[PDB]
Amino acid sequence: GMAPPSVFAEVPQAQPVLVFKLIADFREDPDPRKVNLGVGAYRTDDCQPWVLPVVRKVEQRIANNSSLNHEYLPILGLAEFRTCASRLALGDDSPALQEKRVGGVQSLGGTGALRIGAEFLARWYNGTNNKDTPVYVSSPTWENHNGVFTTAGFKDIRSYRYWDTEKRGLDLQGFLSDLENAPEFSIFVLHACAHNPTGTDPTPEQWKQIASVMKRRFLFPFFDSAYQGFASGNLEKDAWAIRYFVSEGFELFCAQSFSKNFGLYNERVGNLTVVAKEPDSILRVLSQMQKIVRVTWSNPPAQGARIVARTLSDPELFHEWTGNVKTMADRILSMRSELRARLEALKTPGTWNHITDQIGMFSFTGLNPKQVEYLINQKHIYLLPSGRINMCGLTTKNLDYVATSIHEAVTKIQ
Amino acid sequence: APPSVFAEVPQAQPVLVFKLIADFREDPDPRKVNLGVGAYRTDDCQPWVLPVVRKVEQRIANNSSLNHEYLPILGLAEFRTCASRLALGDDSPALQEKRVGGVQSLGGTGALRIGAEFLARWYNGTNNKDTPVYVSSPTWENHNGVFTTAGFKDIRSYRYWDTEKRGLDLQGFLSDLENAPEFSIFVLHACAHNPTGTDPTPEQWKQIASVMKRRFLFPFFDSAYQGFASGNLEKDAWAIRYFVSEGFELFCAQSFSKNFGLYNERVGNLTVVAKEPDSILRVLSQMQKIVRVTWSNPPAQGARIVARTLSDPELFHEWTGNVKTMADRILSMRSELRARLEALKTPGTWNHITDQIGMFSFTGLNPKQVEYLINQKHIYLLPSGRINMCGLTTKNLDYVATSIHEAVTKIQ
Numbered sequence: 076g077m078a079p080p081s082v083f084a085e086v087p088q089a090q091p092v093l094v095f096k097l098i099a100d101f102r103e104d105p106d107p108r109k110v111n112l113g114v115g116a117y118r119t120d121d122c123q124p125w126v127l128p129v130v131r132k133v134e135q136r137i138a139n140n141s142s143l144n145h146e147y148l149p150i151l152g153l154a155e156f157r158t159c160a161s162r163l164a165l166g167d168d169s170p171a172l173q174e175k176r177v178g179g180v181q182s183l184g185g186t187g188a189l190r191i192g193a194e195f196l197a198r199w200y201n202g203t204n205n206k207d208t209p210v211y212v213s214s215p216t217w218e219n220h221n222g223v224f225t226t227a228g229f230k231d232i233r234s235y236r237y238w239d240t241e242k243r244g245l246d247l248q249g250f251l252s253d254l255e256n257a258p259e260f261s262i263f264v265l266h267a268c269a270h271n272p273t274g275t276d277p278t279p280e281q282w283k284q285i286a287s288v289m290k291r292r293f294l295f296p297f298f299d300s301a302y303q304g305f306a307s308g309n310l311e312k313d314a315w316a317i318r319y320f321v322s323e324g325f326e327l328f329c330a331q332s333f334s335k336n337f338g339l340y341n342e343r344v345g346n347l348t349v350v351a352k353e354p355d356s357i358l359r360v361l362s363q364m365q366k367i368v369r370v371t372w373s374n375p376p377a378q379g380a381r382i383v384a385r386t387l388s389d390p391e392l393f394h395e396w397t398g399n400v401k402t403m404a405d406r407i408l409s410m411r412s413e414l415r416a417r418l419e420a421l422k423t424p425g426t427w428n429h430i431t432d433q434i435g436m437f438s439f440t441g442l443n444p445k446q447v448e449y450l451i452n453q454k455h456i457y458l459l460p461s462g463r464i465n466m467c468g469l470t471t472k473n474l475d476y477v478a479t480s481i482h483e484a485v486t487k488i489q
Numbered sequence: 490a491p492p493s494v495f496a497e498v499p500q501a502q503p504v505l506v507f508k509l510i511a512d513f514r515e516d517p518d519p520r521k522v523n524l525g526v527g528a529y530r531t532d533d534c535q536p537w538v539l540p541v542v543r544k545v546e547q548r549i550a551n552n553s554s555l556n557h558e559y560l561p562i563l564g565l566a567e568f569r570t571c572a573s574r575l576a577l578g579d580d581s582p583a584l585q586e587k588r589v590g591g592v593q594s595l596g597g598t599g600a601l602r603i604g605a606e607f608l609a610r611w612y613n614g615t616n617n618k619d620t621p622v623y624v625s626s627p628t629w630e631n632h633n634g635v636f637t638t639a640g641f642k643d644i645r646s647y648r649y650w651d652t653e654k655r656g657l658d659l660q661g662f663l664s665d666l667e668n669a670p671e672f673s674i675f676v677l678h679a680c681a682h683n684p685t686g687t688d689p690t691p692e693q694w695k696q697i698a699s700v701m702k703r704r705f706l707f708p709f710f711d712s713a714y715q716g717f718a719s720g721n722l723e724k725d726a727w728a729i730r731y732f733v734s735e736g737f738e739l740f741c742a743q744s745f746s747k748n749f750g751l752y753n754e755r756v757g758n759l760t761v762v763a764k765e766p767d768s769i770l771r772v773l774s775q776m777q778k779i780v781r782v783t784w785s786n787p788p789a790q791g792a793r794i795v796a797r798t799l800s801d802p803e804l805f806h807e808w809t810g811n812v813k814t815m816a817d818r819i820l821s822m823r824s825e826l827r828a829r830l831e832a833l834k835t836p837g838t839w840n841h842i843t844d845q846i847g848m849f850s851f852t853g854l855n856p857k858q859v860e861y862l863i864n865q866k867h868i869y870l871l872p873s874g875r876i877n878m879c880g881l882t883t884k885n886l887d888y889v890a891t892s893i894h895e896a897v898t899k900i901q
């Protein structure tokens with residue numbers, strides 16, 4: 076019988092993502108000692124997701140409000156959310172805010188913010204529809220950075236030296252050198268704080284050196300701020316770099332995610348903050364951003380944004396939230412401290428100060444792939460081949476086991 | 490002086506439909522009426538949150554076991570399945586043969602965008618941006634917007650509305666179908682055509698399908714109104730189901746903005762039908778990569794509401810009734826708007842106003858009349874002559890029918 080083939084007959088099966096497999100194997104591992112350090116979200120000491128008390132509270136107040144409806148939000152999003160989000164990253168006293176040269180676009184998480192910004196830059200930045208401008212990402216960086224910029228059309232994606240495998244810290248010299256040799260107007264994707272996946276960030280003094288080169292070579296700063304407050308527990312400190320760049324007079328984009336700091340992962344709340352030199356540019360830029368949004372998602376969802384704006388606008392809720400965030404930051408700080416302490420007490424060969432120097436949920440342990448392989452196959456400890464672990468996978472109950480296993484992997488495997 | 494990197498960014502053109510909304514709200518005239526944006530309104534000119542929706546919201550809020558952990562890239566499984574079932578029917582051979590796939594999307598637009606992105610990468614070759622894409626004449630403006638952004642360089646139109654006959658130009662549509670290169674993509678309105686409100690009858694659908702099948706034309710269905718064309722979900726999905734029974738492979742971008750009235754929660758689904766199950770797995774693998782670099786994973790509130798409604802027989806029943814209520818109000822106004830006018834002796838034979846289905850009715854007003862009605866009487870509508878039947882209420886019904894009557898006469 077005649078039968079032409081499907082129009083999807085030659086569509087290949089996309090390669091699977093390592094981590095998605097990792098999570099499956101772990102789930103099937105029957106060993107009661109198994110540990111998951113490959114998780115990508117906050118977890119309590121008893122390995123449970125955690126909905127912020129303040130969030131549960133706000134949801135109840137929203138549910139009980141009969142005045143709300145489901146009519147479309149503006150293309151750019153909930154006005155109150157956008158204002159509060161930018162104010163959070165920039166500070167109430169930001170000169171950019173006082174000078175009315177800030178704009179905000181509600182987006183689908185930090186990912187959506189990054190996509191809209193890249194789409195904009197690929198059409199109106201450094202000329203019209205210039206897909207040739209080099210885009211620089213850290214080496215290594217969150218896998219989706221390359222993906223978002225490549226999909227936006229950018230053809231020249233480069234990397235700047237960041238992690239130093241030997242020193243187990245920041246390769247400032249290599250980074251500086253890459254900045255120096257970057258063509259004028261090149262775009263640099265910078266992690267505001269809590270670098271993903273290394274956990275290593277420049278110190279404020281090092282940020283000053285970075286800013287100095289970007290300043291004179293007209294390098295564009297595209298900040299990715301996915302962990303404000305959640306990183307160190309202090310909202311202000313976590314946004315220092317962004318604010319420093321504003322004070323130094325840069326124009327910039329800042330992709331904000333509220334997934335981790337509000338634990339709203341699945342409500343996709345993000346905001347793209349734009350900082351321009353003159354107020355008039357903001358209207359023109361936002362008008363073009365409206366066009367991009369329109370053909371992507373049309374207009375943004377309301378639930379998450381409503382929660383965040385209510386929280387950030389009511390002093391009582393805001394103060395409660397800052398406490399909920401410190402709680403998260405504090406647990407992570409504890410796990411780092413406790414882990415370093417055990418490794419040192421075990422007299423584990425090598426330096427381990429990077430474990431407490433690092434900031435945030437993610438950490439580049441410095442273990443090689445054979446040591447990681449050992450930890451998985453032998454000790455039932457799941458992590459990525461890169462040595463990256465999520466501190467949230469550690470608990471007061473599994474800290475002893477993890478530390479001794481690592482000590483083992485470091486002493487028996489080469 | 491270091492100039493700004495945004496110095497030369499031009500001022501873009503305002504997204505017209507989202508402009509009228511802003512104009513209305515801030516307009517201070519007391520008799521202002523909004524026949525613009527396509528959203529339901531009660532007979533009191535107020536937004537309507539479906540009773541069934543309010544109930545499900547309450548239950549979600551009272552469920553402490555729910556969390557906010559990321560949903561899978563493709564979306565909430567129960568939603569994807571329920572959504573596809575709604576369009577294809579509980580007894581679709583395609584569902585039984587496990588050759589259906591579903592991708593949760595950011596409303597209807599999001600579903601259209603994802604589908605367009607996939608076609609531009611994997612359909613009719615690799616990275617083939619030359620496959621012609623056809624849209625109706627006229628159509629929802631964002632149709633052209635979405636496909637152009639996906640990279641398609643050849644967007645064409647097919648004859649649809651007959652200005653003089655004020656109906657479907659079946660002969661033109663067929664002729665354009667016949668003259669379209671094989672494998673061209675056709676963007677089809679499942680029902681409640683926007684903005685004409687005019688759809689082919691089942692007999693005409695069969696004719697349209699006959700040519701597509703012969704010429705290997707790809708049907709990309711846009712279903713944003715299942716339930717509004719008639720007030721019955723099953724009847725409104727007939728065309729899609731017929732194509733599926735005829736062995737077509739296709740995409741169907743579903744929106745739940747209107748039928749659930751969840752406009753601001755951005756609930757959509759892209760249903761995919763293939764000849765066999767293995768293709769579904771591969772196609773989905775590719776769509777995950779597309780979604781990943783666009784929104785990463787979808788929001789959950791809206792999808793939770795819809796999956797809950799479609800999975801509970803008691804709630805499904807309540808929802809179908811809430812829909813019929815919306816369609817019935819529309820079915821009502823298509824008459825009182827007509828009556829009124831015939832009475833006001835509005836020069837002409839305005840009958841289409843009641844033969845068209847859905848929330849929109851293509852009247853027959855020139856652009857100058859629109860300007861007159863928006864500026865002098867504050868009746869915000871589209872320049873094309875498209876009016877939202879939902880904007881009408883027994884109250885402003887008189888002020889409206891008169892307003893248009895004054896136009897056609899003095900400004901003709």
Ligand SMILES: Cc1ncc(COP(=O)(O)O)c(CN[C@@](C)(CC(=O)O)C(=O)O)c1O
Nearest residue numbers: 373506526527596597598629683713744746
């Ligand atoms: C045919 C069609 N497809 C898709 C959509 C988008 O649905 P979404 O909101 O779920 O993404 C609409 C909405 N068109 C409206 C009702 C609103 C709009 O322009 O976006 C209209 O007024 O025509 C539509 O009419």
Ligand SMILES: Cc1ncc(COP(=O)(O)O)c(CN)c1O
Nearest residue numbers: 184185186217271301332334785
């Ligand atoms: C550096 C970085 N950037 C962006 C994101 C995207 O976050 P979202 O889930 O809000 O899209 C993440 C994940 N938190 C991240 O780690």
